[PDB]
Amino acid sequence: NVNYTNNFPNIGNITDEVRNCSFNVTTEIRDKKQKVYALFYKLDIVQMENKNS
Amino acid sequence: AENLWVTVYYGVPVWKDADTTLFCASDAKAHETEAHNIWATHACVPTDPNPQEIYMENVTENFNMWKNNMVEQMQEDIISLWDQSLKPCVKLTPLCVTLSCTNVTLTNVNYTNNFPNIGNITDEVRNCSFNVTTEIRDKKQKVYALFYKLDIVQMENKNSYRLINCNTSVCKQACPKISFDPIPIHYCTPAGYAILKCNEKNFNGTGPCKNVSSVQCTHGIKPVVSTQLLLNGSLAEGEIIIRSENLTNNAKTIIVHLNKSVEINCTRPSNNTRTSVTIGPGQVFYRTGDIIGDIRKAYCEINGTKWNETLKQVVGKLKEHFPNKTISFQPPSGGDLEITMHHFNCRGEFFYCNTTQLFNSTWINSTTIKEYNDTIIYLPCKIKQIINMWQGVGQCMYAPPIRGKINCVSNITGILLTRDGGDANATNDTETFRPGGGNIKDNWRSELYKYKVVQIEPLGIAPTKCKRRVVE
Amino acid sequence: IFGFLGAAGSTMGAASNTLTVQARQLLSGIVQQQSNLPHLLQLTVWGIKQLQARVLAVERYLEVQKFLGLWGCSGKIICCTAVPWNSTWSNKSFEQIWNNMTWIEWEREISNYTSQIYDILTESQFQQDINEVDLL
Amino acid sequence: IFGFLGAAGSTMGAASNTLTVQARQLLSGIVQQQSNLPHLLQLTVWGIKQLQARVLAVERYLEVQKFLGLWGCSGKIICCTAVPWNSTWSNKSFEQIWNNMTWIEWEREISNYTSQIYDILTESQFQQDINEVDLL
Amino acid sequence: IFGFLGAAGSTMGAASNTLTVQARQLLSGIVQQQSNLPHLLQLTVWGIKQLQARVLAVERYLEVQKFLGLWGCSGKIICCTAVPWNSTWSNKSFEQIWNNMTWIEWEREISNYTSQIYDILTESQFQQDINEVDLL
Numbered sequence: 010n011v012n013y014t015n016n017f018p019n020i021g022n023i024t025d026e027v028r029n030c031s032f033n034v035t036t037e038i039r040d041k042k043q044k045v046y047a048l049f050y051k052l053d054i055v056q057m058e059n060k061n062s
Numbered sequence: 063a064e065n066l067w068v069t070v071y072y073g074v075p076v077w078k079d080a081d082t083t084l085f086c087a088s089d090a091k092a093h094e095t096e097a098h099n100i101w102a103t104h105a106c107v108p109t110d111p112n113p114q115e116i117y118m119e120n121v122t123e124n125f126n127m128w129k130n131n132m133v134e135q136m137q138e139d140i141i142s143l144w145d146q147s148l149k150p151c152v153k154l155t156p157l158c159v160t161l162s163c164t165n166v167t168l169t170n171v172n173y174t175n176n177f178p179n180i181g182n183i184t185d186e187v188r189n190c191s192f193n194v195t196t197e198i199r200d201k202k203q204k205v206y207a208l209f210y211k212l213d214i215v216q217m218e219n220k221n222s223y224r225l226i227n228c229n230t231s232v233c234k235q236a237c238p239k240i241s242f243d244p245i246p247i248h249y250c251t252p253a254g255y256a257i258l259k260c261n262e263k264n265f266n267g268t269g270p271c272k273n274v275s276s277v278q279c280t281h282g283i284k285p286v287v288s289t290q291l292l293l294n295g296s297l298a299e300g301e302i303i304i305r306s307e308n309l310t311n312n313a314k315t316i317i318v319h320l321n322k323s324v325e326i327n328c329t330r331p332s333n334n335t336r337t338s339v340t341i342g343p344g345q346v347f348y349r350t351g352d353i354i355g356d357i358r359k360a361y362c363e364i365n366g367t368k369w370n371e372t373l374k375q376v377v378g379k380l381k382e383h384f385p386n387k388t389i390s391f392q393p394p395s396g397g398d399l400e401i402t403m404h405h406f407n408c409r410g411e412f413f414y415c416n417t418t419q420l421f422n423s424t425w426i427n428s429t430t431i432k433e434y435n436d437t438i439i440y441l442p443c444k445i446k447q448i449i450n451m452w453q454g455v456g457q458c459m460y461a462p463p464i465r466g467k468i469n470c471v472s473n474i475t476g477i478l479l480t481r482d483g484g485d486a487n488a489t490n491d492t493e494t495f496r497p498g499g500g501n502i503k504d505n506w507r508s509e510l511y512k513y514k515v516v517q518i519e520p521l522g523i524a525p526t527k528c529k530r531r532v533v534e
Numbered sequence: 535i536f537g538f539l540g541a542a543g544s545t546m547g548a549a550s551n552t553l554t555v556q557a558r559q560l561l562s563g564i565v566q567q568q569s570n571l572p573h574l575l576q577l578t579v580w581g582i583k584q585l586q587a588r589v590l591a592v593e594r595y596l597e598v599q600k601f602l603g604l605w606g607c608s609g610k611i612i613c614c615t616a617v618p619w620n621s622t623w624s625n626k627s628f629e630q631i632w633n634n635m636t637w638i639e640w641e642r643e644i645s646n647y648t649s650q651i652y653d654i655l656t657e658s659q660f661q662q663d664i665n666e667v668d669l670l
Numbered sequence: 671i672f673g674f675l676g677a678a679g680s681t682m683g684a685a686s687n688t689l690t691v692q693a694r695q696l697l698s699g700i701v702q703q704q705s706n707l708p709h710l711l712q713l714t715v716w717g718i719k720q721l722q723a724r725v726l727a728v729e730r731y732l733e734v735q736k737f738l739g740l741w742g743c744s745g746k747i748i749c750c751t752a753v754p755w756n757s758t759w760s761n762k763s764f765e766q767i768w769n770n771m772t773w774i775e776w777e778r779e780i781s782n783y784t785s786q787i788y789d790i791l792t793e794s795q796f797q798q799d800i801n802e803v804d805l806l
Numbered sequence: 807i808f809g810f811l812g813a814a815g816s817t818m819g820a821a822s823n824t825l826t827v828q829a830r831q832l833l834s835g836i837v838q839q840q841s842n843l844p845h846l847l848q849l850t851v852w853g854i855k856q857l858q859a860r861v862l863a864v865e866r867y868l869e870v871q872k873f874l875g876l877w878g879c880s881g882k883i884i885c886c887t888a889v890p891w892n893s894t895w896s897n898k899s900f901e902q903i904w905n906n907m908t909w910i911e912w913e914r915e916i917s918n919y920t921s922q923i924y925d926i927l928t929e930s931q932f933q934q935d936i937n938e939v940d941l942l
């Protein structure tokens with residue numbers, strides 16, 4: 010990104026608040042899976058077990 | 063005078079234009095067959111055995127087709143009926159898999175009643191086969207079916223197809239116990255309303271009609287659905303009548319409504335079997351097992367001279383509105399498969415006919431009366447199974463195959479045309495009309511054009527010489 | 535001798551002899567029947583249009599019965615009131631009103647004032663009932 | 671004093687002295703109550719039968735009040751009329767009717783002609799108004 | 807003049823000159839309009855809260871029109887009856903009722919006996935109809 014980020018209210022930034030999670034879903038046809046990444050806010054995911062999952 | 067007083071008359075024949083909720087009413091004889099039709103269900107109240115029409119003599123009323131609110135109500139009713147019928151049926155998500163598809167090798171009798179001599183259903187059908195898991199690990203069993211080429215698409219890794227609908231929507235297989243036969247529907251108003259019907263024989267779309275009659279509710283309107291020709295309905299009385307919202311606006315479809323019917327005869331000479339394979343818990347999927355015996359492309363026969371003279375009369379009427387320009391029909395220019403091909407329904411099977419020998423001609427000056435032979439015109443029609451009847455408002459459907467031979471004989475009572483907007487042909491005077499076009503509402507503006515809903519105002523005030531007797 | 539709305543073209547004089555023909559049919563209809571045969575049939579798409587057709591018929595009848603109750607004309611077809619037509623609503627002669635005019639044309643050319651005749655006809659009846667209270 | 675339909679077996683003479691008990695109960699019902707306790711409860715199986723039992727109660731009241739309005743009997747329990755009995759409908763004497771029949775048997779003998787007696791009643795009231803507009 | 811319920815605070819004798827203001831608004835409303843623009847739009851959350859508003863308006867209006875019909879006061883706003891006042895419902899004088907109370911205060915005072923006055927008023931009208939049958 011841009012380095013300066015227009016730090017006028019200097020409150021912070023949204024690093025350490027989002028997570029880049031990769032998972033497997035199914036395509037239109039069931040039998041072929043695919044791997045998809047998405048940016049999820051840290052308030053929408055929980056850590057169940059087997060750390061980093 | 064100076065001695066007039068207000069008098070209240072209750073029951074005066076005064077109405078006003080209004081929009082209401084026309085319920086359904088159908089006769090008992092057509093139903094009670096326990097076939098459970100889609101549209102004209104049992105929920106409609108029985109109609110009156112003796113309908114009453116009353117002729118208002120000195121009444122001229124402003125009828126306005128293309129702004130009738132009875133067409134919109136019928137469209138919403140048809141859509142709701144189609145959505146409601148398919149709701150309890152079986153989804154086809156488990157069939158959204160990878161099918162490996164190859165050619166078909168059919169055996170047949172030799173003659174096959176080679177009267178039409180059109181072709182055979184090969185190069186239009188395919189085997190598609192797909193895996194099912196079994197007890198032994200890493201072992202699969204092939205399940206076979208015959209699919210039409212219009213219902214499978216090749217994604218990647220050639221010789222590996224998939225169903226057409228698997229990336230657009232979920233399609234429910236039509237339940238086999240419901241019928242697609244159009245049973246007539248009468249649209250009846252509540253008490254306090256009436257339907258004014260224009261009895262004028264040579265009556266265009268909009269204007270003052272001077273032969274109004276009062277009906278309680280309409281006649282039998284069949285919900286038959288077709289695209290290029292208005293099949294299997296009601297004929298005009300006076301003569302061939304051409305109606306459009308504005309004949310100088312080429313974006314407006316033209317409806318030619320005939321006074322003599324022309325019989326079309328559509329048939330599927332093939333042998334289609336049927337086999338059921340269970341998909342999921344309790345749900346089953348019906349598929350075309352094999353085609354053993356006769357193999358031939360489905361086709362429609364139309365008498366040559368009947369159409370050949372109906373076109374002549376239609377051209378004679380068209381040339382009135384376009385005076386000095388020669389009229390020549392041409393085949394459709396493009397679009398979806400429901401526009402380029404005459405789409406209709408026959409015993410639950412969905413046909414798409416070609417119709418190019420019908421609409422390819424020219425009419426220059428009628429210089430000579432050329433005689434011809436009594437010939438029969440054959441139209442080759444494809445068949446589709448995955449049906450998307452309405453573009454994005456309707457629920458998708460899968461039509462199970464029908465065992466045996468299929469044959470529907472129908473009436474042609476209308477044509478849909480669309481004009482091409484020539485600009486610089488001031489010296490080359492020519493007009494070209496192309497069939498098809500229009501939405502589904504134009505199938506019902508050809509039946510609800512005579513009617514107009516009004517609401518009665520039975521309370522009137524006039525001056526008389528009554529004075530109320532004061533009590534004392 | 536005429537049918538429903540059969541006198542809509544006749545003159546007002548000759549079209550007031552068939553008032554009962556258009557008056558018998560403000561509730562009567564086909565809708566009151568149940569069905570061809572008795573899922574959830576009561577919430578079919580055409581099981582709902584019948585439910586709202588029954589309510590529309592009832593409300594349409596009660597819009598005119600509401601007025602006749604206030605005007606004092608309940609139980610009558612041609613009710614003679616005590617409101618003097620002041621000729622501002624219409625100055626047409628008695629001959630021209632009843633002798634080449636139809637009921638539809640008449641309603642149109644006084645359509646501007648029916649909102650005021652209705653309120654006057656109610657006030658005259660109320661003033662009648664007050665006068666009897668302190669008279670009997 | 672009798673209750674609802676309590677004098678249905680008594681003769682027409684003595685069953686006509688309790689017309690008010692069967693007349694107070696053409697609209698009043700339990701159905702006007704809301705529920706035991708107040709998703710979309712207006713769509714429950716028990717909540718649709720209660721909606722159509724309110725429209726049925728209203729409609730069954732109006733189809734008898736509509737006739738009373740046309741005959742000029744609005745607001746009356748017993749209504750005389752200027753329509754003479756032709757005895758083709760029934761040729762019995764006065765004593766054989768009011769002292770030898772119940773209301774149910776009487777309504778079964780003239781079930782042929784009620785479709786015609788209603789039309790004669792409507793025309794008579796209409797002919798009273800025309801004979802009174804062109805007379806005052 | 808006053809609007810709807812505008813004279814709710816005035817005395818009984820002075821708020822009785824505005825009865826037509828609250829009597830003209832028992833069926834008229836906004837509910838009769840269809841919608842801003844017209845699946846199954848009649849099963850929306852506000853398609854049922856409007857269907858039951860149309861039925862509530864009808865039953866509320868027909869609830870008092872039933873009593874007016876029985877009592878013989880159909881088509882009248884102020885109706886005189888032949889039922890004497892026994893003063894056990896209320897023994898206040900003429901000047902302590904029409905010039906000192908309110909229509910809300912008065913109707914709360916005799917709320918005990920309104921269930922009986924309705925029965926007496928209905929039966930008194932029935933006796934009037936019996937008398938004229940054996941009189942004409």
Ligand SMILES: *[C@@H]1O[C@H](CO)[C@@H](O[C@@H]2O[C@H](CO)[C@@H](O[C@@H]3O[C@H](CO[C@H]4O[C@H](CO)[C@@H](O)[C@H](O)[C@@H]4O)[C@@H](O)[C@H](O[C@H]4O[C@H](CO)[C@@H](O)[C@H](O)[C@@H]4O[C@H]4O[C@H](CO)[C@@H](O)[C@H](O)[C@@H]4O)[C@@H]3O)[C@H](O)[C@H]2NC(C)=O)[C@H](O)[C@H]1NC(C)=O
Nearest residue numbers: 095097238239240241243286293294406407409470471472
């Ligand atoms: C324009 O309008 C015309 C006339 O309205 C119309 O032509 C007719 O179309 C209908 C249906 O589209 C045709 O009716 C069907 O005909 C077949 C053929 O019947 C012959 O052969 C059988 C033996 O197979 C004999 O028994 C029979 O007597 C004839 O010789 C029938 O098989 C059909 O029967 C089904 O429908 C009946 C009525 O609903 C049911 O009672 C019967 O049980 C059958 O139902 C079965 O299938 C249903 C699914 O379809 C299923 O739900 C049921 O449970 C059951 O299993 C039916 O009678 C008729 O033949 C046509 N007329 C002619 C002269 O051919 C045009 O189609 C129309 N045009 C357009 C474009 O719509």
Ligand SMILES: *[C@@H]1O[C@H](CO)[C@@H](O[C@@H]2O[C@H](CO)[C@@H](O)[C@H](O)[C@H]2NC(C)=O)[C@H](O)[C@H]1NC(C)=O
Nearest residue numbers: 030031032033034041042043044045046061062
């Ligand atoms: C999504 O599926 C893929 C393949 O099925 C997974 O990738 C493999 O996952 C296994 C899990 O133990 C590893 O042992 C392999 O090394 C992975 N191989 C590759 C090429 O990635 C992937 O882990 C799945 N995603 C999730 C979130 O489980």
Ligand SMILES: *[C@@H]1O[C@H](CO)[C@@H](O[C@@H]2O[C@H](CO)[C@@H](O)[C@H](O)[C@H]2NC(C)=O)[C@H](O)[C@H]1NC(C)=O
Nearest residue numbers: 165166167168169188189204206208351352353
């Ligand atoms: C699709 O192909 C399959 C196999 O190629 C055909 O089914 C076979 O037909 C032969 C007939 O010679 C039989 O011997 C086999 O037992 C069949 N196999 C199975 C799995 O049933 C099928 O006929 C083809 N589809 C057609 C011709 O429509």
Ligand SMILES: *[C@@H]1O[C@H](CO)[C@@H](O[C@@H]2O[C@H](CO)[C@@H](O)[C@H](O)[C@H]2NC(C)=O)[C@H](O)[C@H]1NC(C)=O
Nearest residue numbers: 115117118119260261262263272273274275299
């Ligand atoms: C108004 O409409 C009526 C109803 O159609 C016309 O009566 C028709 O007249 C033609 C002329 O021969 C007959 O063939 C039809 O049979 C008649 N209709 C019926 C239902 O029988 C009438 O001619 C029209 N014009 C006028 C001025 O009334």
Ligand SMILES: *[C@@H]1O[C@H](CO)[C@@H](O[C@@H]2O[C@H](CO)[C@@H](O)[C@H](O)[C@H]2NC(C)=O)[C@H](O)[C@H]1NC(C)=O
Nearest residue numbers: 299300301302320321322374375376377378379
């Ligand atoms: C259907 O309408 C057509 C409209 O053209 C009628 O054809 C006309 O018939 C009259 C009567 O003889 C002729 O004078 C005209 O010359 C014809 N027009 C043309 C363009 O040829 C036809 O008669 C009507 N048929 C029916 C059965 O009503």
Ligand SMILES: *[C@@H]1O[C@H](CO)[C@@H](O[C@@H]2O[C@H](CO)[C@@H](O)[C@H](O)[C@H]2NC(C)=O)[C@H](O)[C@H]1NC(C)=O
Nearest residue numbers: 177325326327328329331363467469470471472
């Ligand atoms: C519609 O087409 C079918 C099929 O061509 C016709 O049925 C055939 O009629 C002939 C008589 O000339 C018979 O010899 C054939 O055996 C029939 N075929 C079948 C499959 O039965 C039918 O007569 C046509 N109907 C119309 C109205 O044109």
Ligand SMILES: *[C@@H]1O[C@H](CO)[C@@H](O[C@@H]2O[C@H](CO)[C@@H](O)[C@H](O)[C@H]2NC(C)=O)[C@H](O)[C@H]1NC(C)=O
Nearest residue numbers: 325364365366367368369370371435436437438
């Ligand atoms: C196809 O249509 C033509 C034209 O109508 C039919 O030929 C007619 O046959 C009848 C028989 O009674 C004659 O009266 C007509 O004069 C003929 N028409 C002409 C223009 O001369 C022919 O019969 C139809 N085809 C079939 C198989 O019936």
Ligand SMILES: *[C@@H]1O[C@H](CO)[C@@H](O[C@@H]2O[C@H](CO)[C@@H](O)[C@H](O)[C@H]2NC(C)=O)[C@H](O)[C@H]1NC(C)=O
Nearest residue numbers: 393394398399401402403415416417418419442
């Ligand atoms: C209907 O049939 C006609 C004639 O069979 C088709 O027109 C031909 O289409 C092919 C496909 O590109 C062209 O190569 C030919 O030049 C066209 N004309 C002829 C005379 O063969 C027409 O395409 C068919 N309709 C549809 C929707 O395919």
Ligand SMILES: *[C@@H]1O[C@H](CO)[C@@H](O[C@@H]2O[C@H](CO)[C@@H](O)[C@H](O)[C@H]2NC(C)=O)[C@H](O)[C@H]1NC(C)=O
Nearest residue numbers: 293294295296297322323324325471472473474
């Ligand atoms: C197709 O057209 C024919 C001829 O117009 C129709 O047959 C006539 O139908 C009417 C009523 O629909 C009858 O009054 C005639 O007696 C019939 N004539 C003959 C010669 O049979 C036929 O009904 C039309 N088909 C459809 C499905 O409407």
Ligand SMILES: *[C@@H]1O[C@H](CO)[C@@H](O[C@@H]2O[C@H](CO)[C@@H](O)[C@H](O)[C@H]2NC(C)=O)[C@H](O)[C@H]1NC(C)=O
Nearest residue numbers: 117118119120121540541542543544545548549
């Ligand atoms: C429709 O209007 C015509 C006028 O053109 C009416 O005919 C007249 O009727 C009156 C009364 O019956 C007669 O005195 C005239 O002599 C008639 N004139 C003609 C030219 O016939 C006719 O009665 C009207 N129809 C209706 C139903 O009102």
Ligand SMILES: *[C@@H]1O[C@H](CO)[C@@H](O[C@@H]2O[C@H](CO)[C@@H](O)[C@H](O)[C@H]2NC(C)=O)[C@H](O)[C@H]1NC(C)=O
Nearest residue numbers: 545626627628629630631632633634635636639
């Ligand atoms: C009788 O009615 C007619 C028409 O309904 C009236 O005559 C019309 O007069 C206007 C001028 O004001 C002309 O423009 C129309 O052409 C006339 N009508 C006809 C049919 O010619 C007439 O005024 C009415 N009678 C009286 C006494 O006023």
Ligand SMILES: *[C@@H]1O[C@H](CO)[C@@H](O[C@@H]2O[C@H](CO)[C@@H](O)[C@H](O)[C@H]2NC(C)=O)[C@H](O)[C@H]1NC(C)=O
Nearest residue numbers: 672675676677678679680681682683684685772
């Ligand atoms: C049912 O009918 C019987 C006679 O058929 C009635 O009995 C009479 O009742 C009256 C009134 O109490 C007495 O005066 C008579 O003496 C009784 N006659 C006999 C033979 O017992 C009986 O009252 C009728 N039921 C009703 C409810 O009226």
Ligand SMILES: *[C@@H]1O[C@H](CO)[C@@H](O[C@@H]2O[C@H](CO)[C@@H](O)[C@H](O)[C@H]2NC(C)=O)[C@H](O)[C@H]1NC(C)=O
Nearest residue numbers: 807808811812813814815816817818819820821
């Ligand atoms: C509320 O009460 C006041 C006080 O009684 C009312 O005001 C009086 O109204 C009468 C009625 O015309 C007048 O004669 C008096 O002059 C008013 N003033 C006083 C001090 O008595 C007032 O009218 C009442 N509200 C309403 C709506 O009537």
Ligand SMILES: *[C@@H]1O[C@H](CO)[C@@H](O)[C@H](O)[C@H]1NC(C)=O
Nearest residue numbers: 011012014021022023024025
């Ligand atoms: C974002 O926040 C982190 C928090 O540690 C900080 O180090 C960094 O400088 C901030 N800005 C950018 C552009 O990363």
Ligand SMILES: *[C@@H]1O[C@H](CO)[C@@H](O)[C@H](O)[C@H]1NC(C)=O
Nearest residue numbers: 167168169170181182183184
């Ligand atoms: C089908 O039609 C084609 C046309 O090219 C022909 O070659 C073939 O012999 C026909 N029959 C079969 C069984 O393919």
Ligand SMILES: *[C@@H]1O[C@H](CO)[C@@H](O)[C@H](O)[C@H]1NC(C)=O
Nearest residue numbers: 265266267268269270306307
């Ligand atoms: C229909 O025809 C009549 C008379 O032929 C004409 O007055 C009217 O304008 C026409 N309407 C249209 C929409 O062409």
